[PDB]
Amino acid sequence: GVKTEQEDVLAKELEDVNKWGLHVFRIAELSGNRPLTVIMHTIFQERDLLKTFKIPVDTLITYLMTLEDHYHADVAYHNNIHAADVVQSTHVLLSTPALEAVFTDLEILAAIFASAIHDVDHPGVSNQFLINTNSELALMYNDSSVLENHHLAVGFKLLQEENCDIFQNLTKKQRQSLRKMVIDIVLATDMSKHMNLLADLKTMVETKKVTSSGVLLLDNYSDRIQVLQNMVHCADLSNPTKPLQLYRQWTDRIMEEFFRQGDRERERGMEISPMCDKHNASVEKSQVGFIDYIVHPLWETWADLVHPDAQDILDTLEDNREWYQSTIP
């Protein structure tokens, strides 16, 4: 009933779970390609979610293993490691001092569950790609948030596999509220929603109320869900905010995925997509664009809402942006 030596080293990595900059690829290697399972397990135990929601531990492991196996290992970015990372980033964001004791256990379970399933069974190409290829997924979801609808359907459907229903002891009220929050969160990970989500976050910062302590006041669902959506969306676009060793790996894998869509976009004759090719499109410019137009406006707006808990993260993101700028000839 003692850990193997591999399991111990993994245990000591997982002492960083509450920390921005977790060694997630290392965890991925130490866990035998189980970052999503071991990180989800670790956060569930730490947040006491098995007791609160009467989740049998064998059902949690079976589901988590089933979930991770429905991420594609042959897709370089949108895989189980990105899922683990977004889970752990949402986890750290939930612990932010400015949100202390704001969210119910169900809101927390929804945020973490949403983060774990949000890219499941991602085929390694984009909505526009799936739409333009006339892919079954684009026809199933009448071309609207094709991937995000799919992730949700698979994430929920896998609860129906043998000993996989992690919510089997929740009441119908709990399950109805959890399912609605998880849908609203994952649908908000579609980048075509980003402009609007950010507008609602800007509006919310101008209106920003607070309790007797420094913690935000969110007295309606519209506001509570908006913060959980923007929190997981922040998690999803958090790569450029990590130490550069991490950030650089995420970039390699996104380019590989995008180049690989490019390669596929040549034989299909579709005409290259966004900065997805060497025969032009510079990686370093692309990262500066991404940071200047998407990642910084969002993270800057988040940082104001939780001022000043997000200062270090915003600093790292400004540094990483200067780094990428200095690499341009």
Ligand X SMILES: COc1ccc(C2=NN(C3CCN(c4ncnc5ccsc45)CC3)C(=O)[C@@H]3CC=CC[C@H]23)cc1OCc1ccccc1C(F)(F)F
**Would you count residue 261 as binding ligand X (CB under 6 A)?**
no
Binding mask 224-253 for ligand X (x = CB under 6 A): ------------xx-x----------xx--
The helix-helix angle for 244-267 and 283-290 (nearest 10°) equals 110
Q: Which is nearer to ligand X, 145 or 286 (CB)?
A: 286
Rounded Cα–Cα distance for residues 67 and 323 (Å): 36
Q: Please say if 194 is a catalytic residue.
A: no
Binding mask 175-204 for ligand X (x = CB under 6 A): ----------------x-------------
Using a 10 angstrom Cβ sphere, with 0-12 exposed, 13-18 middle and 19 or more buried, the burial of residue 123 is middle
Sole window of 26-34, 104-112, 114-122, 133-141 interacting with Zn ion (rule: CB under 5 A) = 114-122
Neighbours of 211 (CB within 10 A): 11
- Name beta bridge partners: 216: 210
**Would you count residue 286 as binding Mg ion (CB under 5 A)?**
no
**Would you count residue 236 as binding Zn ion (CB under 5 A)?**
yes
Query: Quick one: which of 84, 110, 107 has its CA closest to 22?
Result: 84
**Would you count residue 119 as binding Mg ion (CB under 5 A)?**
yes
Query: Quick one: which of 181, 173, 192 has its CA closest to 152?
Result: 181
Q: Which is nearer to ligand X, 106 or 283 (CB)?
A: 283
Q: Left (φ > 0), alpha (ψ -120 to 50) or beta: where does 31 sit? A: alpha
Sequence-distant (≥ 6) Cβ neighbours of residue 101 within 8 angstroms: 215
Q: How far is the CB of 236 from Zn ion (least distance, A)?
A: 4
**Would you count residue 274 as binding ligand X (CB under 6 A)?**
yes
Instruction: Name residue, tokens 């908006």.
Output: 226
- Residue 301 partner contact from Zn ion, Mg ion, ligand X, none using kind-dependent CB cut-offs of 5 to 8 Å: none
- Residue 270 partner contact from ligand X, Zn ion, Mg ion, none using kind-dependent CB cut-offs of 5 to 8 Å: none
Q: Which is nearer to Mg ion, 79 or 189 (CB)?
A: 189
Q: How far is the CB of 32 from ligand X (least distance, A)?
A: 25
Instruction: Name residue, tokens 């589901």.
Output: 63
Query: Quick one: which of 137, 148, 108 has its CA closest to 236?
Result: 148
Q: Which is nearer to Mg ion, 147 or 218 (CB)?
A: 147
Q: Site residues (CB under 6 A) for ligand X? A: 191, 236-237, 239, 250-251, 254, 258, 274-275, 286-287, 289-290, 293-294
Q: Site residues (CB under 5 A) for Zn ion? A: 119, 236
- For the annotated catalytic residues, the residue numbers are 78
